């Protein structure tokens, strides 16, 4: 809720970045192989931005990716259902 759905998004967004590097390192070709850009990648995923920077190539990397979508889109379908109430409440008051 308040900052609770928020926090869970960030657990996912770290572990998602961490496991991404672990799964993708070893597949010849992968771009998702340093912990920085792996983190940016999990945001580009939780938020459905689809910019096209990074993406996984290994099977397990795609599994990590799916979890980020589910657990992120859900968090963000609730962080953004929450940022939308208090600021509209603030300016509607």
């Amino acid at each position, epitope marked *: 809720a308040a900052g609770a759905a928020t926090v869970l998004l960030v657990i996912v967004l770290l572990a998602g970045s961490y496991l991404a590097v*672990l799964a*993708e*390192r070893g597949a010849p070709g992968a771009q998702l192989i*340093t*912990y920085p850009r792996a983190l940016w990648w999990s945001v580009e995923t939780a938020t459905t931005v689809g910019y096209g920077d990074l993406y996984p190539v290994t099977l397990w990397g795609r599994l990590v990716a799916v979890v980020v979508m589910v657990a992120g889109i859900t968090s963000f379908g609730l962080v953004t259902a929450a940022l939308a109430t208090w600021f509209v409440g603030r300016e509607q008051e």
Partner: antibody
Amino acid sequence: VQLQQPGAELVKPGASVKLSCKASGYTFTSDWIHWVKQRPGHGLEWIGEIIPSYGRANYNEKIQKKATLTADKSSSTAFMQLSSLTSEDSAVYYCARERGDGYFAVWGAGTTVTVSS
Amino acid sequence: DILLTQSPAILSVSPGERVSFSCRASQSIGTDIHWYQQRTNGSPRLLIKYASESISGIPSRFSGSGSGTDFTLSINSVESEDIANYYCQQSNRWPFTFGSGTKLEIKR
């Protein structure tokens, strides 16, 4: 000295050998330990990486996979097992500390391996 | 497996002058190149990271240039202590790779 590896080994042809790299300083969860090989008068040949904490290792696709990587999670020392060597396998072997951001900040002194009888 | 190609192989120069080693990649890697110096008998040593950013404890002679498939290590001046081999290394796609290397000679 951060990364710290022995000076020189001597292996009979066909025999195995284990190589060490004890690393003071920090011992982060996310740290990776790489191994690079320098045949005399040659460039730098990446061999493979290992994240010690978690435990996985990935080797160089292209070279004849002779070796295997291991680590000791609460000794801060990592290992590399070269198995059944020729004289093509004689070189200097460095370990490197990649933080997870893509460059080898820290290098060991290098271990010189000479495969002869 | 990405190909880093350092032309030329050797580099002659007179002391105090500027000097630039080219590295050229077999496909775009943005800025994820890094430069290493390796003197005679010594281990390699990071010089520039991410193709432009400098390392703390490196002489201000060294300057990182380039992006894309063309990169450039440069030394704004030269003196006798910079004689060594020089290597690049991409970190943009697995596996990490290295360059062929360039050695620096000084006409004195």
